[PDB]
Amino acid sequence: KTFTQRSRLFVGNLPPDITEEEMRKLFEKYGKAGEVFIHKDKGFGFIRLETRTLAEIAKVELDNMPLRGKQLRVRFACHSASLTVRNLPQYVSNELLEEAFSVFGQVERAVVIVDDRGRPSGKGIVEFSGKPAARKALDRCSEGSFLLTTFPRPVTVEPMDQLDDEEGLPEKLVIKNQQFHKEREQPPRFAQPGSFEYEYAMRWKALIEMEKQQQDQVDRNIKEAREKLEMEMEAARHEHQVMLMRQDLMRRQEELRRMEELHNQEVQKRKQL
Amino acid sequence: QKRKEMQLRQEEERRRREEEMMIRQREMEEQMRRQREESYS
Amino acid sequence: QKRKEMQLRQEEERRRREEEMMIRQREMEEQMRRQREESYS
Numbered sequence A: 001k002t003f004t005q006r007s008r009l010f011v012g013n014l015p016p017d018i019t020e021e022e023m024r025k026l027f028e029k030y031g032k033a034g035e036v037f038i039h040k041d042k043g044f045g046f047i048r049l050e051t052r053t054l055a056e057i058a059k060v061e062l063d064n065m066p067l068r069g070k071q072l073r074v075r076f077a078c079h080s081a082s083l084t085v086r087n088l089p090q091y092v093s094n095e096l097l098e099e100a101f102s103v104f105g106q107v108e109r110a111v112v113i114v115d116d117r118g119r120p121s122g123k124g125i126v127e128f129s130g131k132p133a134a135r136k137a138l139d140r141c142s143e144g145s146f147l148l149t150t151f152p153r154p155v156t157v158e159p160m161d162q163l164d165d166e167e168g169l170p171e172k173l174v175i176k177n178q179q180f181h182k183e184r185e186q187p188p189r190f191a192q193p194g195s196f197e198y199e200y201a202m203r204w205k206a207l208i209e210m211e212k213q214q215q216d217q218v219d220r221n222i223k224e225a226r227e228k229l230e231m232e233m234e235a236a237r238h239e240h241q242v243m244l245m246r247q248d249l250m251r252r253q254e255e256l257r258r259m260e261e262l263h264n265q266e267v268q269k270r271k272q273l
Numbered sequence B, C: 001q002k003r004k005e006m007q008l009r010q011e012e013e014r015r016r017r018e019e020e021m022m023i024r025q026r027e028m029e030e031q032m033r034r035q036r037e038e039s040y041s
Helices: A020-026 A052-062 A094-103 A131-143 A178-182 A196-231 A233-272 B002-040 C002-040
Strands: A008-012 A045-048 A073-075 A082-086 A107-110 A126-128 A156-158
Touching: A008 A052, A082 A094, A082 A131, A094 A107, A094 A126, A126 A131, A131 A156, A196 A233, A196 B002, B002 C002
Parallel strands: none
Antiparallel strands: A008 A045, A008 A073, A082 A126, A082 A156, A107 A126
16 A cells, blocks of 8 residues: 555664754655654664555665665564464455454455465464554454354454564674584584484484474364364254244243233222222 | 384374265265255245 | 264264274284294293
């Protein structure tokens, strides 16, 4: 969209004498700007751009450019209003998430995660605009049961972790302490069979494979429980219909009896006088 | 090792058998629902 | 009633298969014990 959190940009390593006027002039090549949140002392703040195209152009055109003897470090700000929604219904659309979670606020975009074949993965990714809407939606969908469609399966909603695969691990950002040297005595390589390394790596591989077996066992248990729970839907639905009908009929018959007795008593006391 | 191989073979057989039972049961449920909706009309 | 009778039939089939697999496991255990006795001597 326009004026969203994807157009937002984090600017860092600015000179301490930056100005809001020169800040706007700095991005003046890319149309208007949003919230000019800047810190003179620590040298970084929050800036907002207009659209996705302009943000993609400007951040990559502005990084690696020194400014007053300081090579700029501008980065994509990790989105804060993020949610993730799970156990989505078998039939779901982008606009279904855009409209359902529109109740809790403005959904800038929610897009059912899809794999290569086109089938849904079974998860979701919802990015509101503001944080408080995200908190309210998360707590409500935790305490409530946010049904999405006729199929009565509520969607579990969790906060999303920001796995950053852009900056990776630059060399100069590692601690490089005595442990690093202790861990960099010998280069990466294979383990010679029969050595200490090979045996201890066999121990690690056994541990990892047993962990994977445990995870698949949990997956199988949940899958069989879910398949059992989907089949007993009809029986539970019909039983609840029968219970509701029986309670309603009890209520109606008691209402009839009370109306009859009140009419009888009032006519009796009327004719007595 | 021998016990582990035997156990995994038994587990695979059990999974296949349970899948067959499950598909039979869901087929019965589908036919049953079809009978119900036929009786409704 | 239909669902319960189907479930009972499924359970009977599962029980017979489980007993067959238990018999197989006991036979394997006996054969292994024979092999261990042979190797010990």
